[PDB]
Design a protein around this nucleic acid. Structure first.
Ligand SMILES: [Mg+2]
Ligand SMILES: [Mg+2]
Ligand SMILES: [Mg+2]
Ligand SMILES: [Mg+2]
Ligand SMILES: [Mg+2]
Ligand SMILES: [Mg+2]
Ligand SMILES: [Mg+2]
Ligand SMILES: [Mg+2]
Ligand SMILES: [Mg+2]
Ligand SMILES: [Mg+2]
Ligand SMILES: [Mg+2]
Ligand SMILES: [Mg+2]
Ligand SMILES: [Zn+2]
Lengths: 64, 193, 103, 140, 39, 135, 136, 77
RNA sequence: UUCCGUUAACGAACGAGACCUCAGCCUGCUAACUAGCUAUGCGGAGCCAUCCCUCCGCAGCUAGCUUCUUAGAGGGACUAUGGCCGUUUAGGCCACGGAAGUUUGAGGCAAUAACAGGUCUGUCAUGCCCUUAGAUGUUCUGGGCCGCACGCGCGCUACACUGAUGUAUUCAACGAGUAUAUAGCCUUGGCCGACAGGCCCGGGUAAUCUUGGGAAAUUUCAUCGUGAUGGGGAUAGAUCAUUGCAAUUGUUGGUCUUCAACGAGGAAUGCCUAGUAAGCGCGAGUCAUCAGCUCGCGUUGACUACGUCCCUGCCCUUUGUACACACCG
């Protein structure tokens, strides 16, 4: 039973996508504040946003 | 805090409490500044990026109401419909109809979506997460389209269609166009996970 | 004795009109007339839109011309012999003067 | 020696509020402000009045007049001219510091009560009806 | 029964203000009649 | 008084006013017409003629020199021309006229020097008190 | 309250639906537009807030009378739809099937006369001066 | 529903909205608009907008009329 | 190709920027009875009335009147201040302040070399060629450009209830107005007229008269209640009127009637990033009359985005070429 986890967008690493549509960011977990995992987000995002994250394992890789 | 400001002078903003600390930033209901009496304002928004996370939630929805061409460009009818809906939300639940609006906005927002990503040289779609601001954007658009196509060629009126959809969505049932489309977008993205 | 005369003055040029009116005005102040002006009147802007092509093909591109006509008046409380005592000094280019005896 | 005549401006709607130090009158065009008639945008014209309170009006009469513009433009001029006449009257006749609380309440609620909006209708360019639109384009 | 003061052509006149020229003769004599084109 | 009251209920009071405050003449075509060329149907109102009169009465109350054509203009409206774009169409004038002769024969208004129709000093009395008798 | 509510009426043999205002139910009759229906209802002096079907037979009779002798009601010559006829010259309100008859009357007149208008009808293409490259 | 064609089928002018139906149709929320139950009491309008002119003088509810003729409902108080 | 700078380069010319116009700000200046508040005097109407208080109209040696209106001269904004990034260079992102911090917005102008781009149907602009009286000259009468199996393009009106119809309510800006002859372009007021439209005395060569442009959408009050319905208004019949020397292949506008297809639209495709799209009307050109167009003006007024090279292209650099009318090779 996967429970949604929230993470904060500490710094935006870039704006990836084939068409330039996906921001590619670093999320720092609120629950255990040593887990920095790197993800793809859709839509306007700026630094510090709390982000609802259904699955934790799925991560991006630099220039995914 | 000090809040002798009720929109339409009857609907108290105080005691507004959003569970999502994700959207506590992106909903204009809490801090002393976003309160306004009326969801109509001659705002200079859209001049700069992210300025709309500060637009009042009710005005921002009212802007999404005035849609499909015959109805583009008349905000007064939009705020009128908001008032009639906004009244009858109270006239059904007897709770802060503002709480109903905001809880529906929260509960009708996809948490994962499928974009068209490619990597390493080839493209085919992939699921991504939802920045909370486009969460809120799409909830507004999608609740409003639900109401509009519930009211098209139907004797029932738009104010009360929209009230019906907000009430059952903020309830959380799968009786709203809004939550149905939410859940299908979420399950497609879960598929392409 | 001292009658009521009006001076109707208009041109195409801002600078040139502003020079002529000030010439008449200081003329009036040298002779200590009862002078009232120069009242400014709203500028009439003749305009034309013309398809700048002479044959009619290519992108439909128009050009707009505008002649501005600037309207000014001054009231003088004088006798017309004093009026021609004054208003004989040089008149700068392009400006137009049409003194009228009023009620 | 109280007499102010202070205005407010929107797209083209220009509103001028001239005051006496009377008692409580606040009219628009001789008609009470209580009747301003976008009758959903009847909150807007009252916003200065309800932000301040009548207690800040028990010594003033506002025979505010509005000319030109549209309808909501006129509401948004009336709001502005009420706010700007209030701050001008306090600043010149109550006190600067006492006026500071009024400006900080108003600019706390919003800033567009006091300062005009520079936005206007911008001219339409040939080759398409619309300020920023164009004719529909066909290749074949 | 109306032509240019200029080229005697009965198509595309500019009759407003009494120019009585065609749209092309008016461009040809445009800036000397005094239609200074600020815009 | 009149400016101090809602712009509608004044007309609602005054329409019954010059029904019950005595009576007058009324030409015998009132019931057929559309009252404006661009219209589509005769007014749904049974006492539409009195409301016409009340509205024009407050027009003349709060302006001087309103003409046979100005009343046409202020009561015209939008004319959907069919597939053509809609435009502005002036209302019909002979409907406005007999309203003016009713208020004139009642002395509510009268013809103006310099042209037009000006409120009469006593018609002013009538409208002001009928407005004072409103909530 | 329709104790005897009649759902279709057969007035003038055009099947007036019994669920619409007497106003906008007579429109079904060919020759009774919205406006001429309204004026007929006025000059027959009928309570208008009445679904034709709750309305009574005397009222049906008066509707008959006002539509087969309208000019006797001072109703102007200009509601009628055969003004200044050329058969006779009388001013008439032609009725459900009489309208079809009169339309054929005018068409056959023109067909005999050899009008451009008539041969235009006889060919079937548009009759009112209209371009026809791109429409019809 | 066929709710102004049906305006005359005498059950409406006999008992239907003579507190036979909208004594209970309010009871869900005790305050449930006429316009909003135009489809919760699926029956449509003008046999339903006449009955609320009826039931205000039948003295059974409170009313609001505004822009869209937008009328409302309250059960008993 | 804007600069810092590097530097077999040095120094210069156009283009860019600068320049011009409109719009945004100024209770600072010059003024203004062709503009206009403001106060007082009277005059009307309401009212604890006798005076006052409120809305109105009239005229002034009322202004130690110019906010509103007009338009002149100026001022203002430069990224100036602060922060972080930056060779702490050119600059960039952020924050107070300010009307203004995409160069503030929008345009105008806009380079070398061209294209076999368009126009001899704009010209007493024009080579050559054809025609020159029984004329491709010119004039007149009539038809024609408008004819419709059918394909395509820009648009107009709609498929409704976030609406239609019927009252009531009330708010712009652009502009426009020939001796036009016996009132004559825009047309006020009065009368006649259901409408169309007529008759009368007028005003203005215009911030003076039209028009302080009383625009619609929108706003309230009802009426319709999901129905090809009262949405929709094509098609046609009958009649009147205006413009025109002349209305036929219906000029146009009314009246009454006919009530057609159209259920949100296939593959595909257009425009658009803030007073913007979209909705709404107005003016102007054309005009004896005809505006579904085009050019301007205002009114209501947003969703999304602040990115990318994925598609369609443009600029520069390296690179390969058997191409050069150049990959449509
Ligand atoms: Mg509906
Ligand atoms: Mg620029
Ligand atoms: Mg052709
Ligand atoms: Mg085109
Ligand atoms: Mg309407
Ligand atoms: Mg219709
Ligand atoms: Mg394309
Ligand atoms: Mg025109
Ligand atoms: Mg090779
Ligand atoms: Mg090689
Ligand atoms: Mg070669
Ligand atoms: Mg090839
Ligand atoms: Zn020419």
């Amino acid at each position: 039973d996967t429970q949604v986890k929230l993470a904060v967008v500490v710094k935006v690493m870039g704006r990836t996508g084939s068409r330039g549509q996906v921001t590619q960011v670093r999320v720092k977990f609120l629950d255990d504040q040593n887990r920095l995992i790197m993800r793809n987000v859709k839509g306007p995002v700026r630094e510090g946003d709390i982000l609802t994250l259904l699955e934790s394992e799925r991560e991006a890789r630099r220039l995914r | 805090p000090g809040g002798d400001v009720k929109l339409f002078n009857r609907w108290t903003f105080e005691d507004v409490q959003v569970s999502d600390i994700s959207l506590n930033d992106y909903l204009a209901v809490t801090s002393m500044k976003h309160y306004t009496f009326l969801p109509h304002s001659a705002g200079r928004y859209s001049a700069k990026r992210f300025r709309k996370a500060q637009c009042p939630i009710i005005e921002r929805l009212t802007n999404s109401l005035m849609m499909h061409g015959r109805n583009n460009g008349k905000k007064i009818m939009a705020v009128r419909i908001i008032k009639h809906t906004m009244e009858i939300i109270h006239l059904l639940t007897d709770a802060n109809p503002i709480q109903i609006i905001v809880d529906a906005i929260i509960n009708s927002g996809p948490r994962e979506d499928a974009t068209r990503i490619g990597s390493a040289g080839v493209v085919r779609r992939q699921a991504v997460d939802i920045s909370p601001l486009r969460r809120v954007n799409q909830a507004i658009y999608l609740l409003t389209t639900g109401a509009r196509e519930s009211a098209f060629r139907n004797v029932k009126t738009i104010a009360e269609c929209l009230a019906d959809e907000l009430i059952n969505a903020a309830k959380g049932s799968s009786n709203s166009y809004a939550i149905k489309k939410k859940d299908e977008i979420e399950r497609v993205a879960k598929a392409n996970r | 004795v001292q009658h009521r005369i009006r001076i109707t003055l208009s041109s195409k040029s801002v600078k040139n009109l502003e020079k002529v009116c000030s010439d008449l005005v200081k003329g009036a102040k040298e002779k200590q007339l009862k002078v009232k002006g120069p009242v400014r009147m709203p500028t009439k802007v003749l305009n034309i839109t013309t398809r700048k092509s002479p044959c009619g093909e290519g992108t439909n591109t128009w050009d707009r011309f505008e002649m501005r006509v600037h309207k000014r008046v001054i009231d003088l409380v004088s006798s017309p012999d004093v009026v021609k005592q004054i208003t004989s000094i040089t008149i700068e280019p392009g400006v137009e003067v049409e003194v009228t005896i009023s009620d | 020696p109280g007499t102010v005549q202070c205005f407010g401006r929107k797209k083209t709607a220009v509103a001028v509020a001239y005051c006496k130090p009377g008692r409580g009158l606040i009219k628009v065009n001789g008609a009470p402000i209580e009747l301003i008639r976008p009758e959903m945008l009847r909150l807007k014209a009252f916003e200065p009045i309800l932000l301040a309170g009548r207690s800040r009006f028990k010594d003033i009469d506002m025979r505010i007049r509005v000319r030109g513009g549209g309808k909501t433009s006129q509401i948004y001029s009336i709001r502005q001219a009420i706010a700007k006449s209030l701050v001008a009257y306090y600043q010149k006749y109550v006190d600067e510091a006492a006026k500071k609380e009024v400006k900080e309440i108003f600019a706390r609620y919003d800033r567009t009560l006091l300062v005009a909006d520079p936005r206007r209708c911008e001219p339409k360019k040939f080759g398409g009806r619309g300020a920023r639109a164009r004719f529909q384009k066909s290749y074949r | 029964s109306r032509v240019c003061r200029v080229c005697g052509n009965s198509h595309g006149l500019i009759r407003k203000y009494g120019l009585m020229c065609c749209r092309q003769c008016f461009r040809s004599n445009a800036k000397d009649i005094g239609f200074i084109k600020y815009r | 008084t009149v400016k101090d009251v809602n712009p509608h209920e004044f007309v609602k009071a005054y329409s019954a006013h010059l029904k019950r405050s005595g009576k007058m003449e009324l030409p015998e075509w009132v019931d057929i017409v559309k009252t404006a060329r661009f219209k589509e149907l005769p007014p749904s109102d049974a006492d539409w003629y009195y409301i016409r009169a009340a509205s024009m009465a407050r027009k003349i109350y709060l302006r001087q020199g309103i003409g046979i054509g100005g009343f046409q203009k202020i009561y015209g409206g939008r004319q959907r021309n069919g597939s053509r774009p809609p435009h502005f169409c002036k209302s019909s004038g002979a409907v406005s006229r007999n309203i003016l002769q009713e208020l004139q024969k009642m002395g509510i208004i009268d013809v103006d020097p310099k042209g037009g129709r000006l409120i009469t000093s006593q018609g002013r009395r009538d409208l002001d008190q009928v407005a004072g008798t409103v909530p | 309250a329709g104790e005897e509510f009649q759902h279709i009426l057969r007035v003038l043999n055009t099947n007036v639906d019994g669920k619409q205002k007497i106003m906008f139910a007579l429109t079904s009759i060919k020759g009774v537009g919205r406006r001429f229906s309204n004026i007929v209802c006025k000059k027959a002096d009928i309570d208008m807030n009445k679904r034709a079907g709750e309305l009574s037979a005397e009222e049906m009779d008066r509707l008959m009378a006002v539509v087969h002798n309208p000019r006797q009601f001072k109703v102007p010559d200009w509601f009628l739809n055969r003004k200044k006829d050329y058969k006779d010259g009388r001013f008439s309100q032609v009725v459900s099937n009489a309208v079809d008859m009169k339309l054929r009357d005018d068409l056959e007149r023109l067909k005999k006369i050899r009008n451009h208008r008539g041969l235009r009808h006889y060919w079937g293409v548009r009759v009112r001066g209209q371009h026809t490259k791109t429409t019809g | 529903g066929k709710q102004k064609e049906k305006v005359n089928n005498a059950v409406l002018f006999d008992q239907a909205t003579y507190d036979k139906l909208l004594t209970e149709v309010p009871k869900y929320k005790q305050i449930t608009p006429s316009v909003l139950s135009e489809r919760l009491r699926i029956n449509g309008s003008l046999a339903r907008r006449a009955i609320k002119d009826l039931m205000e003088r039948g003295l059974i509810r409170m009313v609001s009329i505004h822009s869209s003729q937008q009328i409302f409902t309250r059960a008993t108080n």
